[PDB]
Amino acid sequence: KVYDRCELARALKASGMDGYAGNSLPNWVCLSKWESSYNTQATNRNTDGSTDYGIFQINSRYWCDDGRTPGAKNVCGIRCSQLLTDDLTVAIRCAKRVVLDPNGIGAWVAWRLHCQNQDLRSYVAGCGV
Numbered sequence: 001k002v003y004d005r006c007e008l009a010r011a012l013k014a015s016g017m018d019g020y021a022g023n024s025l026p027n028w029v030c031l032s033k034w035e036s037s038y039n040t041q042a043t044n045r046n047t048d049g050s051t052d053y054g055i056f057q058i059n060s061r062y063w064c065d066d067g068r069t070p071g072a073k074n075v076c077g078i079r080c081s082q083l084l085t086d087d088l089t090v091a092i093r094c095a096k097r098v099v100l101d102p103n104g105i106g107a108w109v110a111w112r113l114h115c116q117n118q119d120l121r122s123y124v125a126g127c128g129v
């Protein structure tokens with residue numbers, strides 16, 4: 001599913017992402033936009049043999065099992081395929097686990113690049129949330 005920006009903002013807000021581990025909602029909309037263009041089916045293979053999955057582009061070396069990643073740890077305890085559904089429940093639960101690690105939201109390259117220190121007002125403008 002390719003989410004609409006406000007549609008995605010509402011689903012994140014409904015799921016407790018606004019302020020999760022001190023990360024306001026606009027943070028999460030901004031990184032979803034840059035990481036996958038709001039597409040739950042987005043996949044990106046890395047040089048190291050790992051692959052990034054879904055809306056949040058979660059990596060198969062540490063968080064999920066895709067069965068072809070060398071030295072994989074599967075910390076979210078899921079199949080990477082579960083990160084590609086239109087339904088965001090499992091993706092959200094795993095993104096919540098990812099942000100508890102020491103690096104917080106800096107775990108996401110797109111957040112570090114396009115969102116950190118930025119004015120993120122525009123990502124939720126007009127969503128009425």
Ligand SMILES: CC(=O)N[C@@H]1[C@@H](O)[C@H](O[C@@H]2O[C@H](CO)[C@@H](O)[C@H](O)[C@H]2NC(C)=O)[C@@H](CO)O[C@H]1O
Nearest residue numbers: 056057058059061062063098101102103107108
């Ligand atoms: C969103 C995602 O899947 N991000 C990735 C980062 O988690 C991953 O960072 C690595 O995360 C581990 C788990 O918290 C850390 O123990 C490890 O220190 C770490 N490393 C760094 C190098 O910042 C990176 C790199 O594997 O990949 C991103 O895809």
